[PDB]
Each structure stands twice: as C-alpha cells, then as structure tokens.
Amino acid sequence: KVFGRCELAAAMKRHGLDNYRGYSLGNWVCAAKFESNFNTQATNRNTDGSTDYGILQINSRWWCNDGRTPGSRNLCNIPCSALLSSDITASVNCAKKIVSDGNGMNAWVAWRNRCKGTDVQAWIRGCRL
Ligand SMILES: [Cl-]
Ligand SMILES: [Cl-]
Ligand SMILES: [Pd+2]
Ligand SMILES: [Pd+2]
C-alpha cells in the first residue's frame, strides 16, 4: 500500500508515534517519505546481504527474520514480511523498539540526512489529526 501523507500521519498518531521518545509526528512522516516514499511494500538489499523492509526500511540485520540473513538478530520478533503489510502496526511497534536504542532516530540514515534539523512539521501541514 502506498499511503497518503496525512493518512500515514493519522495512522502513526493512533499508534502513539506522535512525540514518542520526543520525536514529533512530522519526524516519523518525514522518515517514511525518504525511506519508502510511503510504500509499505518497499524493500532494499544491503551490502552485507541483509535487507530493509517496509515504510521505515527496518533492517533484517537486527530487527526481523527474513530467513536469508545469516547470523542476524530478530529483536522485534517478527518475520520481516510483517513489515510490508498494509497494516503498519508491525512497522510502528518495531520502530518504537528501534528508537529506544542509544541512537534514537539517527538509526535511520535517511532521517539523519534528510529530516533531522529541517522543518519536519511541514510533512503534517494541513492534515486532520
Ligand atoms: Cl521468534
Ligand atoms: Cl490494525
Ligand atoms: Pd518469539
Ligand atoms: Pd493491526
């Protein structure tokens, strides 16, 4: 599923991402925009053989099991396919655990390089939340 900007903003809000660990909703919407272009089915292979899945490009190296990432961890305890679903719960819930790690949203390189320090509130401008 390709989410609408405000549609994603609202779903993320309902799952309690607005100001989760101090990250305003616009940060999360911005991160999803540059990770997946709001496409839940987005996948990308890493140089190490791991793969990134879903709206927030969660990496099989640490966070999910895809059956093809030798020696990886599954810290969210999900099959990676669960992160490609039209239901964003698995991605949001997993992302909550990721952002609790020492680095916060800096774990998402796209966030750091495209969202951090920018006007992320522009991403939710005009949405009914
Ligand atoms: Cl398990
Ligand atoms: Cl649901
Ligand atoms: Pd388990
Ligand atoms: Pd659900």
From Swiss-Prot:
Active site: 35, 52
Keyword entries, A-Z: Allergen, Antimicrobial, Bacteriolytic enzyme, Disulfide bond, Glycosidase, Hydrolase, Secreted, Signal
Pfam family of the protein (one): Lys
Residue sites binding substrate per the record: 101
GO molecular function: beta-N-acetylglucosaminidase activity; identical protein binding; lysozyme activity
UniProt domain C-type lysozyme: residue ranges: 1-129
Transmembrane annotation, as ranges: none
Top-level taxon: Eukaryota
GO BP terms, alphabetized: cell wall macromolecule catabolic process; defense response to bacterium; defense response to Gram-negative bacterium; defense response to Gram-positive bacterium; killing of cells of another organism
Coarse class of the protein's main subcellular location: secreted
Compartmental location: Secreted
EC number: 3.2.1.17
InterPro entries: Glyco_hydro_22, Glyco_hydro_22_CS, Glyco_hydro_22_lys, Lysozyme-like_dom_sf
Disulfide bonds: 6-127, 30-115, 64-80, 76-94
GO annotation, cellular component aspect: cytoplasm; endoplasmic reticulum; extracellular space
UniProt tissue specificity: In the egg white and polymorphonuclear leukocytes.
Catalysed conversion reaction: Hydrolysis of (1->4)-beta-linkages between N-acetylmuramic acid and N-acetyl-D-glucosamine residues in a peptidoglycan and between N-acetyl-D-glucosamine residues in chitodextrins
CDD domains reported for this sequence: LYZ_C
Purpose of the protein: Lysozymes have primarily a bacteriolytic function; those in tissues and body fluids are associated with the monocyte-macrophage system and enhance the activity of immunoagents. Has bacteriolytic activity against M.luteus.
Entry's family note: Belongs to the glycosyl hydrolase 22 family.
Misc. remarks from the entry: Lysozyme C is capable of both hydrolysis and transglycosylation; it also shows a slight esterase activity. It acts rapidly on both peptide-substituted and unsubstituted peptidoglycan, and slowly on chitin oligosaccharides.
Oligomeric form and interacting partners: Monomer.
Protein name: Lysozyme C
Organism lineage: Eukaryota, Metazoa, Chordata, Craniata, Vertebrata
